[PDB]
Amino acid sequence: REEAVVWDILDEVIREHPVLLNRAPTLHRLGIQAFEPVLIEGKAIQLHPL
Amino acid sequence: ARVTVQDAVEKIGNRFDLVLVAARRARQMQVGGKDPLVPEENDKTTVIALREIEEGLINNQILDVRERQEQQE
Amino acid sequence: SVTEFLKPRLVDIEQVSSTHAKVTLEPLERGFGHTLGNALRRILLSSMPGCAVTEVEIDGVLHEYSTKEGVQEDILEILLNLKGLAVRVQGKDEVILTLNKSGIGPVTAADITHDGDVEIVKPQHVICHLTDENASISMRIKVQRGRGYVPASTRRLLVDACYSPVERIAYNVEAARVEQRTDLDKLVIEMETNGTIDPEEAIRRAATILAEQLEAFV
Amino acid sequence: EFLKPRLVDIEQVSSTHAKVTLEPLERGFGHTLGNALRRILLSSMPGCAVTEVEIDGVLHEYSTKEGVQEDILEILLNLKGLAVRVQGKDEVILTLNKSGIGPVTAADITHDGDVEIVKPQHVICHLTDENASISMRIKVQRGRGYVPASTRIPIGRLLVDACYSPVERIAYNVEAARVEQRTDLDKLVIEMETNGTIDPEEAIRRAATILAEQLEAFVDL
Amino acid sequence: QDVVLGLYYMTRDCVNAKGEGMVLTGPKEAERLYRSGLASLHARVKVRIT
Amino acid sequence: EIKELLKLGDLPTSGQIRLYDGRTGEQFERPVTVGYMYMLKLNHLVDDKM
Amino acid sequence: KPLVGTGMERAVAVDSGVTAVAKRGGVVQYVDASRIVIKVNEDEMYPGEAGIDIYNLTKYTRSNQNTCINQMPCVSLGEPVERGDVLADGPSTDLGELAL
Structure with missing residues (x-):
C-alpha cells in the first residue's frame, strides 16, 4: 500500500548497508564494487563519475 | 559514518583477520546482549564494531580472553 | 493552498572556530536554495x-x-x-x-x-x-x-x-526529503569573517539589507 | 544608508507582455534583485x-x-x-x-x-x-x-x-539611471511575457512578498 | 573528460586579463575577487601562500 | 550559404550567442553554440528495463 | 517536421503504406476523424458507375512493436485534391513528410 512510515523505515535500514554494483562483462576485479546506496527518485541507478 | 578501513587494517595484521574479528564482534553485539564499548551514533552493527577495532580496545586475543572468562562461569 | 510555502525548519549552526561557522537550512522549496544562497552571497561580497x-x-x-x-x-x-x-x-x-x-x-x-x-x-x-x-x-x-x-x-x-567584514562565503545545495517529496532543496552556508563580527550576526545583516530593498512592494 | 526601490511605470506593449521599470538602485543590486525576482516569477x-x-x-x-x-x-x-x-x-x-x-x-x-x-x-x-x-x-x-x-x-x-504558471518567459536588463547628483544609480527593467491572466504589477508584488517572507527566516537567525 | 577540461581552464594564465599584477593577501582573497568580477579567473598575480 | 542565411535574419554570423547562467545570473565567460537540432526518442525506455 | 532535411522525406512517407493517397482527383466532400469522402472530378469518371471514393482511416491500432498506429486527416472541407496527394498522414508523418 506504500504508506508513509515505510519510507522512514526504509531510510533507516539503508544507513550503512552496502550493495554490490556490477556491470557485465566483468573483465577485471574492479567490475564488481561495493557502495552505500542513497535513496533517490526515478528509475535509474545514479553512478559516481570517478 | 565509516568511509574507509585504513585504521582498522593498520591495527591488525591483514584485512582478512580484520573481517573475521569484526564479524565475530558484530555477531556478539547483535544476536544477544554485549552492549557496545563505544558510544553509537545510530550506526549499524558492522560499523560500531569496526570503530571498536580502530580504537585498539578489541582484537582477536581480547575477544578470546573475554569469551574464556565468560565461559568459565 | 497557493500562497503558503515550505519554511525552513531545521537550522544548525556549527561553530568550528571563533570566526568560522556553518549554517544549514532544511527544507526549502525546489529552486529556492539557489535564489537565497546567491542573493546572500552577492550581498555579503560587495554590499x-x-x-x-x-x-x-x-x-x-x-x-x-x-x-x-x-x-x-x-x-x-x-x-x-x-x-x-x-x-x-x-x-x-x-x-x-x-x-x-x-x-x-x-x-x-x-x-x-x-x-x-x-x-x-x-x-x-x-x-x-x-x-x-x-x-x-x-x-x-x-x-x-x-x-x-x-x-x-x-x-x-x-x-x-x-x-566587507567577510573573508570567504560559499553555499551548497543538497536534496532534502519531506514526506513523499524528495526534490526539496537544502542550503548549507559556510562562512568565515575577519574577526570584526561573528558569522552568525553578519548573515543576519545581509538578510536585513535585502528586506530593506523590498519594503515598497510587500 | 541604502536607497528604496519602487515601481515607476508599467509600460504595456501588448495584451500579453509588458515591462516594469524600477526606482534607481545601488550598485550590486541590479543583478541581485533581478535574478531573484526572475527565479521566483518563473518558479511559483x-x-x-x-x-x-x-x-x-x-x-x-x-x-x-x-x-x-x-x-x-x-x-x-x-x-x-x-x-x-x-x-x-x-x-x-x-x-x-x-x-x-x-x-x-x-x-x-x-x-x-x-x-x-x-x-x-x-x-x-x-x-x-x-x-x-x-x-x-x-x-x-x-x-x-x-x-x-x-x-x-x-x-x-x-x-x-x-x-x-501564467508567465512564459521573463527577461531583465540593467541600465544607467540619472537622478539627483549620483552617477552610481541604475534602474532595473523587467520585460515579462504572460499568457494574459496576470497583471505585471500584481506578479511583481507577489514575487517580492514571497522573497521577503522567505528571508524572514534568515533575519530571525 | 569534463573534470580535466575544467581544471585546465582554471590553471592556465593569460598575458593580459582583468586585474593583473595586483598582490593578494592569500588564496581566500583570490576567490572573493573572481566571484566579485574584479579579476579574471586567470590573471598573473602575486599571492602569499602557506 | 549558412552564413548568408544567418545574416538574413537577426542572428550573429558566427552562430555562437552569449548565454547567462540560470541559477546565478552571471554571464558565461565564453560564447556558446546555440541552435535547433532534431532529437529522436529511441525505443529503449528505462521503465521497461528497471 | 525536421527543420533540416534532405528531400527524401516525401518519398519515404509516400512509398510506405502509412499515408492515405488519393487514387483519383476531386474535391473533399466530407472530412472526418475516421473517413474521407472524395467526389471525383468530372474528367476522371469511368463511363459507367461514376460514384465517389471513400477512405477509411485506422485509429489507434496496435503495431508489431506495441507502438500506436494512427492516421489523422490533413485536408479541409471543400478543398481540391489531385492524384498522388496525401489525404491523411500516418504515424511519424507531417503533411505527407517523414518526421520521426
Whole structure:
C-alpha cells in the first residue's frame, strides 16, 4: 500500500548497508564494487563519475 | 559514518583477520546482549564494531580472553 | 493552498572556530536554495558595510618599489599586513592612526597608538618584522568606512580597501526529503569573517539589507 | 544608508507582455534583485488552468467522435493551452456547446461573471458535419507549477496535465539611471511575457512578498 | 573528460586579463575577487601562500 | 550559404550567442553554440528495463 | 517536421503504406476523424458507375512493436485534391513528410 512510515523505515535500514554494483562483462576485479546506496527518485541507478 | 578501513587494517595484521574479528564482534553485539564499548551514533552493527577495532580496545586475543572468562562461569 | 510555502525548519549552526561557522537550512522549496544562497552571497561580497584601511603614509619610502633599511622583509608584505588588519570604528567615517616602533622585535597591532574610538580585534597580528636595534619605523594609517571591495587601481601609498567584514562565503545545495517529496532543496552556508563580527550576526545583516530593498512592494 | 526601490511605470506593449521599470538602485543590486525576482516569477506564480474534461459522447481519450475533425486527444491538447482567470472561488466548471459547420472557438463557452476569457479566438475543435453537436464540461482549478495528471490521482472523465504558471518567459536588463547628483544609480527593467491572466504589477508584488517572507527566516537567525 | 577540461581552464594564465599584477593577501582573497568580477579567473598575480 | 542565411535574419554570423547562467545570473565567460537540432526518442525506455 | 532535411522525406512517407493517397482527383466532400469522402472530378469518371471514393482511416491500432498506429486527416472541407496527394498522414508523418 506504500504508506508513509515505510519510507522512514526504509531510510533507516539503508544507513550503512552496502550493495554490490556490477556491470557485465566483468573483465577485471574492479567490475564488481561495493557502495552505500542513497535513496533517490526515478528509475535509474545514479553512478559516481570517478 | 565509516568511509574507509585504513585504521582498522593498520591495527591488525591483514584485512582478512580484520573481517573475521569484526564479524565475530558484530555477531556478539547483535544476536544477544554485549552492549557496545563505544558510544553509537545510530550506526549499524558492522560499523560500531569496526570503530571498536580502530580504537585498539578489541582484537582477536581480547575477544578470546573475554569469551574464556565468560565461559568459565 | 497557493500562497503558503515550505519554511525552513531545521537550522544548525556549527561553530568550528571563533570566526568560522556553518549554517544549514532544511527544507526549502525546489529552486529556492539557489535564489537565497546567491542573493546572500552577492550581498555579503560587495554590499556589506564596514571600516578598513585605505591608504598608508611612510616617511622612509615614497614609492611602492623602494627599500627601507632595518627590515628583513619588503614593503609589499608590509602593505599586505596592513591590508589584512581588521579594525572596527564606531561613528567616525575617517580616522588617522600613528604607529611608532624601534629596535629588534616583531611589530604587532597592539603597538599601534589609537584613540578610544579605534579598536583592533587582533592585537597579535604581525604588521612587520624588524631585525635591527638602531632601526626605527613610523607609519600613518588611514581607516575609512565603506562598502564592498575597492581595488587600488580604481582609486602616500594606496591600499586595497577590504571594507566587507567577510573573508570567504560559499553555499551548497543538497536534496532534502519531506514526506513523499524528495526534490526539496537544502542550503548549507559556510562562512568565515575577519574577526570584526561573528558569522552568525553578519548573515543576519545581509538578510536585513535585502528586506530593506523590498519594503515598497510587500 | 541604502536607497528604496519602487515601481515607476508599467509600460504595456501588448495584451500579453509588458515591462516594469524600477526606482534607481545601488550598485550590486541590479543583478541581485533581478535574478531573484526572475527565479521566483518563473518558479511559483498562481495559475488557473484546466484539469478535467467531460465530453458526453466519449468514454476515453483514444476514441473519436462523429462529425469532429480532430481526435479527442487533439481536443484535450488544445484545451490544455486555454488561458482563463477566475475571481470568486478556486475551482469552476465551464460549459461549451456548438452545432453546425464551423470552428468551435473559446468564445462559445458560457459567460459567467467571475470567469473571464482573455483569448476568445482560441480554437478547440472543428465541426465538419451539417448536424453535429459538441457538449463538454470543462473544469478549471487554481494551483502552482506543473502538476502531472499521473500523480494527483467514473469513466466519462478525461484528465489533462495542468500547467498552472501564467508567465512564459521573463527577461531583465540593467541600465544607467540619472537622478539627483549620483552617477552610481541604475534602474532595473523587467520585460515579462504572460499568457494574459496576470497583471505585471500584481506578479511583481507577489514575487517580492514571497522573497521577503522567505528571508524572514534568515533575519530571525 | 569534463573534470580535466575544467581544471585546465582554471590553471592556465593569460598575458593580459582583468586585474593583473595586483598582490593578494592569500588564496581566500583570490576567490572573493573572481566571484566579485574584479579579476579574471586567470590573471598573473602575486599571492602569499602557506 | 549558412552564413548568408544567418545574416538574413537577426542572428550573429558566427552562430555562437552569449548565454547567462540560470541559477546565478552571471554571464558565461565564453560564447556558446546555440541552435535547433532534431532529437529522436529511441525505443529503449528505462521503465521497461528497471 | 525536421527543420533540416534532405528531400527524401516525401518519398519515404509516400512509398510506405502509412499515408492515405488519393487514387483519383476531386474535391473533399466530407472530412472526418475516421473517413474521407472524395467526389471525383468530372474528367476522371469511368463511363459507367461514376460514384465517389471513400477512405477509411485506422485509429489507434496496435503495431508489431506495441507502438500506436494512427492516421489523422490533413485536408479541409471543400478543398481540391489531385492524384498522388496525401489525404491523411500516418504515424511519424507531417503533411505527407517523414518526421520521426
